[PDB]
Design a protein around this nucleic acid. Structure first.
Lengths: 108, 105
DNA sequence: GCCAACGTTGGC
DNA sequence: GCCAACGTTGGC
């Protein structure tokens, strides 16, 4: 077990072909965020053990297990939220200005 | 044909575009992927048509999509074969024109 | 942690 | 229509 990851560490894989997304939607009871990673090959990964397996099956360069966080409250990568309207459910990408209020909204 | 400005329009409405370049049986070739705002990966134009028909009609139309890997919009990746194995790398803005030329042709 | 069985998807 | 590739579930 190690110290908490810094925002600069969580940004590191995004300089080596990875993408990080946070997706916010209304659950059974409340709003909640989930974090996805995309590997450089385009593989979608939704769970930390999946990232561990991927790193083990690929060449070890600068990206390691300590540069990954599945926290939707870490402001790294693209943020999206599922907005319901009479017209229907619509996913919308958040602006840099909007992200802080959403992170606060899903912090207990 | 679509203009770069047209192909950029969905990217202002939560879509993502990627071009992926790899060695085929005979030559280097490119393919285009889109991600919808909901995170759905779409590799074929007819899948985008189906997706648009199933969703609210606003600014984004079929004419805003290009599956041409020669269209310089979105992020570019390339599969390199090395002794350590196949490795995908994201291309820099500097590298992309040379790779588009290499798959034109 | 890994792997078999099985369900789903996408594209020919 | 099929079936390779991908995702899910449950076994030790």
């Amino acid at each position: 077990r190690r110290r908490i990851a810094t925002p600069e560490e969580v940004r590191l894989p995004l300089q080596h072909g990875w993408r990080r997304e946070v997706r916010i939607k209304k659950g059974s009871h409340r709003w909640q965020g989930e974090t996805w990673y995309y590997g450089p090959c385009g593989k979608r990964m939704k769970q930390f053990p999946e990232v561990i397996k991927y790193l083990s099956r690929n060449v070890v360069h600068s990206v390691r297990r300590e540069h990954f966080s599945f926290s939707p409250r870490m402001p790294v990568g693209d943020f999206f939220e599922e907005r319901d309207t009479p017209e229907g459910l619509q996913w919308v990408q958040l602006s840099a200005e909007e992200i802080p209020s959403r992170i606060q909204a899903i912090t207990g």
